[PDB]
């Protein structure tokens, strides 16, 4: 009983300190910065071959290889430059909602409604791709996957909890709890020591991978968060929600810096990504478009008008030379 | 593709594309149906030709030159809104209801309203099954159908009680172009695959009418 009052006053103290820091809005400091102009980007590749809807996609660290997961039970690895199909991996279950590409390029990960994260080894002596390990322990669907090393992966599930695995042993090294709803996405910090997650309780929190502790929590969205991405310098992140708005938070300030809402946008954001510099913020909506925002001034700098259905995934190469988007129409397009 | 090693890489890609095309053709005669309903509703014993295969359970019985795949999503214990779109393209929804579970009737009715009015299922027809007639006929005599439905006004006979139950479920449609194929099945009813097949035939014809431009 008394603890409830203790909780409420603690929240008030957090809000009090949070308000004290705010002196001037981000849009109030970057008003005299000249705009970026109209960002016109034209499609360069159109990777076709997927039958069902594409639900996930990840870029290789070499900025040339791609991996895409579709509802037809196929995991295809593409050669971005030549549009060649390097691999085609059949999946035990066709219900897949995520896929990840290892930083070293030796492994690839997959998961979905089966509540299992499957890891496939690409550099095998037998010449075929084999399922190296199957990670189980989540009681709900799998939302996101991200490799930390060749033997460490972070997963997000609809259980309202995240996890850190040891692929070699296969056991669950650490479990992150604190969310009150389905966890829909996560992003690893550039130094791979902190990561943030967006859940369906309309909140995001910063987790210390080494300590297994919730360092900070960020609110402001009116609905569930669908996508999340770190700023390139690792001191901020952006979130996409069904509220039809994207928001930029700052870890050090511990607040919301800016909002990217437009009166003409009515649908939710499915994916969010940054550019190499951190000035453009690319988001994919349900209206079959991706809007490029001037992340420093919140102005629509362009639109990637393509695909005939909902855009489900986004990606920007590590060298920042292209942007790939996947949609439910079963086509991947690379923009430059 | 000028280099010798690049030419072989192109050859491998064409081999993959051919296999991908072949796999699609072999998975073209499959009808995907979604199973829904409360627990102990008979959603695990609809068609006795199971051939099954925590998470998502599949059943892949075949009947009359057509491969039927039934997906059971029980056990997710999550918010439906975030994975319901994964089944947006299912041919139809098979909804099961137990007439002998008065206390579970209201939960089923809420389920039907949510599923029927979902933005993704605005066009998918529903094949409603009202299972366990015999128990309902035995239970109605001892307990009248008034405790579960205080607004019931008709007689206390099996024909009227079953008709009233069906009407309530059908009243949640509130949309055109979507039809509900209601049927009454018992425990010893082998001809459950026939009901799904003929119901699916009508759904397929209506879909073709839209694509062919006749509607």
């Amino acid at each position, epitope marked *: 009983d008394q603890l409830r009052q203790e909780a409420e006053q603690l929240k008030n103290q957090i809000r009090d300190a949070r308000k004290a820091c705010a002196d001037a809005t981000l849009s109030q400091i970057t008003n005299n910065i000249d705009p970026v102009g109209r960002i016109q980007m034209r499609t360069r590749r159109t990777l076709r071959g997927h039958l069902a809807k594409i639900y996930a996609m990840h870029w290789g660290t070499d900025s040339r290889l791609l991996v895409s997961a579709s509802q037809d039970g196929k995991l295809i690895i593409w050669d971005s430059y030549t549009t060649n199909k390097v*691999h085609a991996i059949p999946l035990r279950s066709s219900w897949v909602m995520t896929c990840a590409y290892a930083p070293s390029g030796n492994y690839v990960a997959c998961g979905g409604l089966d509540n299992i994260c499957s890891i496939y080894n690409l*550099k095998t*002596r037998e*010449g075929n791709v084999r399922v190296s390990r199957e990670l189980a322990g989540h009681t709900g669907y799998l939302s996101c996957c991200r490799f930390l090393d060749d033997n460490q992966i972070v997963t997000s599930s609809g259980d309202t909890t995240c996890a850190l695995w040891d692929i070699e042993t296969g056991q669950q090294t650490t479990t992150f709890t604190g969310h009150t709803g389905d966890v829909m996405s996560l992003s690893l910090a550039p130094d791979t020591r902190l990561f943030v997650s967006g859940a369906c309780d309309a909140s995001a929190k910063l987790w210390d991978v080494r300590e297994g502790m919730c360092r900070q929590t960020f609110t402001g969205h009116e609905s569930d968060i669908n996508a999340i991405c770190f700023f390139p310098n690792g001191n901020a992140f952006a979130t996409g929600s069904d509220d039809a708005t994207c928001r930029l938070f700052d870890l050090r300030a511990d607040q919301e810096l800016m909002t990217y809402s437009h009166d003409n946008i009515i649908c939710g954001i499915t994916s969010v990504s940054f550019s190499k510099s951190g000035r453009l913020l690319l988001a994919g909506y349900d209206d079959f478009n991706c809007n490029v925002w001037d992340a420093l001034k919140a102005d629509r700098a362009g639109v990637l008008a393509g695909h005939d259905n909902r855009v489900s995934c986004l990606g920007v190469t590590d060298d920042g030379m292209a942007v790939a988007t996947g949609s439910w129409d079963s086509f991947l397009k690379i923009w430059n | 593709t000028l280099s*010798a090693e690049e030419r*072989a*890489a192109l*050859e*491998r890609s064409k081999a993959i594309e051919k296999n991908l095309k072949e796999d699609g053709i072999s998975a073209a005669k499959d009808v995907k149906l979604l199973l829904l309903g409360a627990d102990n509703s008979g959603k695990s014993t609809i068609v006795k030709q199971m051939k099954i295969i925590t998470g998502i359970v599949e059943t892949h019985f075949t009947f009359k030159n057509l491969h039927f795949r039934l997906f059971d999503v029980g056990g997710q214990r999550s918010e439906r809104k975030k994975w319901i779109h994964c089944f947006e393209d299912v041919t139809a929804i098979i909804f099961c209801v137990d007439l002998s579970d008065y206390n579970r009737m209201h939960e089923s009715l809420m389920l039907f309203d949510s599923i029927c009015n979902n933005k993704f299922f605005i066009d998918t027809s529903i094949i409603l099954f009202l299972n366990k007639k015999d128990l309902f006929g035995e239970k109605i005599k001892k307990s009248p159908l008034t405790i579960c439905f205080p607004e019931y006004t008709g007689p206390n006979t099996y024909e009227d009680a079953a008709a009233y139950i069906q009407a309530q479920f059908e009243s949640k449609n509130r949309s055109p172009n979507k039809e509900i194929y209601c049927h009454m099945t018992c425990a010893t009813d082998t001809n459950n695959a026939q009901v799904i097949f003929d119901a699916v035939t009508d759904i397929i014809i209506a879909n073709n009418l839209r694509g062919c431009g006749l509607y």
Partner: single-chain antibody, 233 residues
Framework: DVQLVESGGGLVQPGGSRKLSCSAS????????MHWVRQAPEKGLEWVAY????????YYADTVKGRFTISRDDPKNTLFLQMTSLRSEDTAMYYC??????????????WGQGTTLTVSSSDIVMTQATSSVPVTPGESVSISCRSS???????????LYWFLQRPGQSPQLLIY???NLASGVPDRFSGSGSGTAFTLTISRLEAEDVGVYYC?????????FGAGTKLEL
């Protein structure tokens, strides 16, 4: 483990015919292109024929074109070479080699054990200047080989391969394009070059590095090897 075993060699009279069989066991034989490479008695490696994955593409050397035919039997996991009219110049040890071609692959990693055949009695030229190089353990070594055309392509890939053959064993891949260390080889080996001049440098030479080193070009068929450089201890 990956294993290629060949059989069908022996003694044959001139003008006769023989069949060589190479049976694979331990990998997806259906997914690997296969080569036939022959080594005449203490002469050097020579490329003979190549059959793609699925048998779509086939190549032959000008020497054996018409006389030889290469066939693949995927269900049985066997590779065949049917030789029709054999001269006295066809006597050699025939090797079965596997190659998988996709972006970033190693297309000559594994070589067969080899089968001996005895018979009774335009192209890119790659040259290795030196034939022998005495050296002792712990001393750095360098081996170089030139070419007629520039092996560098518009892709940016230099198509050159380095193989090492130990006394009494089959050749082993070390560097597959110009500097990529083949899986399993020690990191002491290194490769470098530009266009038409290439060099392989070994640091902290060991007792197991004695053998013959061949430099091969995979830019365009027919594949061609180098004369070979021998390391003497």
């Amino acid at each position: 483990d990956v294993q290629l075993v060949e059989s069908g060699g022996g003694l044959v009279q001139p003008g006769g015919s023989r069949k060589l069989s190479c049976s694979a066991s331990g990998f997806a034989f259906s997914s690997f292109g296969m080569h036939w490479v022959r080594q005449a008695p203490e002469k050097g490696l020579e490329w003979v024929a190549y059959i793609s994955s699925g048998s779509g593409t086939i190549y032959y050397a000008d020497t054996v074109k018409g006389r030889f035919t290469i066939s693949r039997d995927d269900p049985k996991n066997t590779l065949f070479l049917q030789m029709t009219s054999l001269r006295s110049e066809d006597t050699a040890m025939y090797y079965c080699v596997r190659s998988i071609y996709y972006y970033g692959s190693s297309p000559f990693d594994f070589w067969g054990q080899g089968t001996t055949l005895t018979v009774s009695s335009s192209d890119i030229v790659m040259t290795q200047a030196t034939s022998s190089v005495p050296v002792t353990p712990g001393e750095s070594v360098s081996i170089s080989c030139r070419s007629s055309k520039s092996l560098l392509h518009s892709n940016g890939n230099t198509y050159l391969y380095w193989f090492l053959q130990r006394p009494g064993q089959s050749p082993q891949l070390l560097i597959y394009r110009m500097s990529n260390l083949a899986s399993g080889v020690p990191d002491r080996f290194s490769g470098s070059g530009s266009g038409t001049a290439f060099t392989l440098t070994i640091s902290r030479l060991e007792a197991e590095d004695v053998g013959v080193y061949y430099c091969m070009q995979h830019l365009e068929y027919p594949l061609t090897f180098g004369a070979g450089t021998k390391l003497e201890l």
